[PDB]
Amino acid sequence: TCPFYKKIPGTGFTVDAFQYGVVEGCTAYFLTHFHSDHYAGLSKHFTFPVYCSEITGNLLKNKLHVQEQYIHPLPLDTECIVNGVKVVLLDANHCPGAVMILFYLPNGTVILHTGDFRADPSMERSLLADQKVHMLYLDTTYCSPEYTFPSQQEVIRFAINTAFEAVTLNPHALVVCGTYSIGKEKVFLAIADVLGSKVGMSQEKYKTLQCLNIPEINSLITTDMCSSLVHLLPMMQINFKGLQSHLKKCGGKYNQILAFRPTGWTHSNKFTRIADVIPQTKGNISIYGIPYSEHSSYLEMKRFVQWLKPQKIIPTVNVGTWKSRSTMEKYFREWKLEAGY
Ligand code: NI
């Protein structure tokens, strides 16, 4: 049965609610982004209207084989009508195609559903500023003060400098980047751009990237592994064993690997500045763990919510345990007392 946190009250709308079969009373199913926990249940067998961004629609058609008749793409930053209700999709600063949805209810209530997001100050100067938002459905992935991380830009600058140095020292070194879903494409795109290369990958991953509306993409990526000095592999294969095996496959064209593992947070974010990062090394393979997040830090989340001043918050992440719900409720009350709403 569909949870209350996936229903928009006073409409027949749901958000990210595809794993429950037919939801009784639902006339329009929104999909915030193409991550499998959110699209779970969608397939060529789905026959109700799905509303989403253009990029998400491209993925639904080509990767999941959802029939075109049921895909309803909407543009961003544009007031649209769906089933007699005014809605706006906003960029979520998550993965490609990911949106937040603003619902303008017939009774006059305004609801923001963030989907998955990485809060940013630029959101305080969007259409959200034009009116009061009463209810917030919030991505609470990192809703605890220990979760700090660097900016995306600091992480990219580190990755670019690291790769340029290693390949200038050894022109026969290969760079490898791990991946398992869409998101975090700037890691590999920026390293390839500094090295004057295309990015090589599997046919399945190339197909995915060709759905993302990236300008000039044919100049940036290829399925010809041989021609390229930045390669993508599944995250699972970024270990000494998998990287040695891969080096064997390339026809001795490279004698060394430098690899990146973009992660979420792990325990050592608590001490180590990006400049201090050092890799794990075994012989001619070195691997760097880099904390590249597409979710809000605690401080980013707190800033956004204290700016928005919602009357009610409904979390969408870590809601399966009481302990987690209680802890989140405590932070929400702190933030409200501090900021005066
Ligand atoms: Ni996501």
Swiss-Prot record:
Quaternary structure and partners: Binds constitutively to TP53BP1. Binds CDC27, which is itself a component of the anaphase promoting complex (APC). Binds PIAS1.
Query: Which species?
Result: Homo sapiens (Human)
Q: In which tissues is it expressed?
A: Expressed in brain, heart, kidney, liver, pancreas, placenta and skeletal muscle.
Triggers of expression? During mitosis. The mRNA encoding this protein contains an internal ribosome entry site (IRES) in its 5'-UTR. This 5'-UTR generally suppresses translation while specifically promoting expression during mitosis, when cap-dependent translation may be impaired.
Q: What's this protein's family per the entry?
A: Belongs to the DNA repair metallo-beta-lactamase (DRMBL) family.
What is the stated purpose of this protein? May be required for DNA interstrand cross-link repair. Also required for checkpoint mediated cell cycle arrest in early prophase in response to mitotic spindle poisons. Possesses beta-lactamase activity, catalyzing the hydrolysis of penicillin G and nitrocefin. Exhibits no activity towards other beta-lactam antibiotic classes including cephalosporins (cefotaxime) and carbapenems (imipenem).
Which portion of the complete protein is shown here?
Answer: 700 to 1040 of 1040
Q: What result is annotated for mutating residue 139 to N?
A: Impaired nuclear focus formation, reduced interaction with PIAS and increased sensitivity to cisplatin
Task: State the compartments where it is located.
Answer: Nucleus
The protein, known as: DNA cross-link repair 1A protein
